[PDB]
Amino acid sequence: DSIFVKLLKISGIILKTGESQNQLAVDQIAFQKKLFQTLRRHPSYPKIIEEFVSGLESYIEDEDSFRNCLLSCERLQSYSKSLIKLLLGIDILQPAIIKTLFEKLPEYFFENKNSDEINIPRLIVSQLKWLDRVVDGKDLTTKIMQLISIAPENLQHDIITSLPEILGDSQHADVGKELSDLLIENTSLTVPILDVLSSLRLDPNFLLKVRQLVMDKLSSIRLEDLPVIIKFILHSVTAMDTLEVISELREKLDLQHCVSSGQSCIILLFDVIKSAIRYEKTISEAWIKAIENTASVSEHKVFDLVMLFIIYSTNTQTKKYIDRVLRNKIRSGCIQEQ
Amino acid sequence: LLKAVQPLLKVSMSMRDCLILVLRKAMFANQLDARKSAVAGFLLLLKNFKVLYNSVANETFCLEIMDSLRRCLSQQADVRLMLYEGFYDVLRRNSQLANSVMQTLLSQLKQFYEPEPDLLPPLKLEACILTQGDQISLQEPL
Amino acid sequence: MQIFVKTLTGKTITLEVEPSDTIENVKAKIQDKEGIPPDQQRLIFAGKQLEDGRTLSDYNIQKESTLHLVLRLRGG
């Protein structure tokens, strides 16, 4: 009866009641291009999109029909993306869809995991992930940051952890600053912001600043946080700041005050360090050359044995250098039985 | 390595849908090599994965990848330039993508072409320069 | 009974499973309630990676235990 449901029927998707996954008569690309060219050929072309989103928003006021609109489409010719996700690929509908999608989300902050234990905020933010085009950067940026501001803790944690796949290249460093605005606000939200700043695109000066803000407070960190922190530290090293950050890291790391979750998180930390030394020689070679430069003091610790075994196992071209360093270290009265 | 592998991907299907997943998740990386590795993989899959298995299972499948390639044209200059140099070989080895590929270029032209006569610079060169924080970069090598 | 699964980024979810349940049942439940595919999951308990075919009884998993989830690729 509405223009929305009728144009969905013409474009080749059947809109059902709300209890099972919605069918799809044609291919996703064919449906998208047909809906696009049918909105193009209709008169009052800049104004029909308002009637479209009005019909959509009046349809999705029911929770079950909206939940079916968030779920995977049934493919006759067998699973595909959601109808919101398919409409999100079309550029003329996209900003109004983002507006209405960000509009009604604070209604669902407290009615979480209702019937079949799906998080409707998590579903509506997974409608945003792996977008091919973002038509407007700055409006989506301010909307997502105000959503992170107003949301309760665990839901906004999901919004943070999903930020690298959402945002386009024109809006990294802006969210580079504003995430650091949230970083000084709470100590409970250090680690997803640190993983996001490890995974976004940032300029190295800001990365140096936030690395210093991590590195001053390294002793106030329980072991659970220690992988995603140290990964961030081994992917913020410059070509000139190698030995300094490696020496500071090898000084500050205890691995004893933290010591069933502990052993598992230790294995995760050493996985992280293997991944960091695998493909960047500038950290492995500087770690080996930062061990023999602490041959003076006989008080070096358990870490410098395990790390020599790790770099000896992982990297093959540094085997002879590790062998020579171990021989010249053991002949110096250093590493022994104890 | 992806030139070598692909006789697996003509045979296999699970490995093909593993690769596309890797490449699509690789486009959203931060390290520089990952973007250009993803475009190299996408262009190879466009290139040798049909002439035009079932043909109906290819003409949509490249039209999936092609939509993913409209991410890369939004990204930085080197990732664009690999597409601009690759599309000619894609058209040569895969003819029926032509009606899509030219459209992918033509809309890409329309952000920089001012199609009104008697305005004397016919190209928008002030949008092909990215300036922020006194860092000046070329993007979209027109 | 109730166990916990902790991600790398520190998000904890609660899983209602029995020791008769296999590991791929836990992976399918994580896929149902978090959206992460079961091919991308990699579970760690007591510094041991949990294999696919075994059960919760094979690795001494009792209630209120914490597994660790590592993704094979980033953000899924």
Tokens of A101: 């999608």
Tokens of B130: 């990215």
Whether C28 is covered by a domain: the verdict is yes
Distance CA B30, CA A206 (A): 15
Helix (H) or strand (E) holding C66: strand C66-69
Residues in chain A: 338
Please say whether the beta carbons of A302 and A259 come within 8 A: no
What DSSP string runs through A243-276?
A: HHHHHHHHHH--SSS---HHHHHHHHHHHHHHHH
Please say whether the beta carbons of A199 and B30 come within 8 A: yes
- CA A115, A120, A121: angle at the middle one, nearest 5? 150
Distance CA A28, CA C9 (A): 34
Residues in chain C: 76
Whether C57 is covered by a domain: the verdict is yes
Please say whether the beta carbons of A334 and A300 come within 8 A: yes
Residue of chain A nearest C68, judged by CA positions: A264
Please say whether the beta carbons of A70 and A125 come within 8 A: no
* CB-based contact A200 B30, cutoff 8 Å: yes
Whether C45 is covered by a domain: the verdict is yes
Distance CA B68, CA A131 (A): 9
**b/e string for B42-56 if b means 16 or more Cβ within 10 A?**
bbbbbbbbbeeeeee
Interface test with B, best of A169, A170, A207 (most B CBs within 10 A): A169
**What is the residue type of B120?**
L
Distance CA A33, CA A30 (A): 5
DSSP for residue A333? T
Whether C66 is covered by a domain: the verdict is yes
Helix (H) or strand (E) holding C3: strand C2-6
Give the 3-state DSSP-derived string for A113-138, with helices as H, strands as E and coil as C: CCCCCCCHHHHHHHCCCCCCCCCCCH
Indicate the resolution in Å: 3.6
Other Cβ atoms within 10 Å of A128 Cβ, number: 22
- CA A138, A139, A145: angle at the middle one, nearest 5? 85
- Listed residue (A168, B33, A232, A43) closest to C9, CA to CA: A232
Beta bridge partners of C45: C48
**b/e string for B72-103 if b means 16 or more Cβ within 10 A?**
bbbbbeebbebbeebbeebbeebeebeebbee
* CB-based contact A169 B67, cutoff 8 Å: no
Domain count of chain C? 1
Please say whether the beta carbons of C40 and C69 come within 8 A: no
User: Is the alpha carbon torsion for A323, A328, A329, A333 positive or negative?
Assistant: positive
| Pairing verdict, β A23-24 and A72-75 | parallel
Q: What's the gap between Cα C32 and its chain centre?
A: 12
C76 touches B: beta carbon within 8 Å: yes
Whether C31 is covered by a domain: the verdict is yes
Please say whether the beta carbons of B94 and B55 come within 8 A: no
Whether C63 is covered by a domain: the verdict is yes
Rg over alpha carbons for chain A, rounded to the nearest Å, is 26
Whether C76 is covered by a domain: the verdict is no
Residue of A130, A169, A173 with shortest CB distance to B75: A169
User: What is the domain-level CATH number for residue C55?
Assistant: 3.10.20.90
Residue-range definition of the domain harbouring residue C31: 2-71
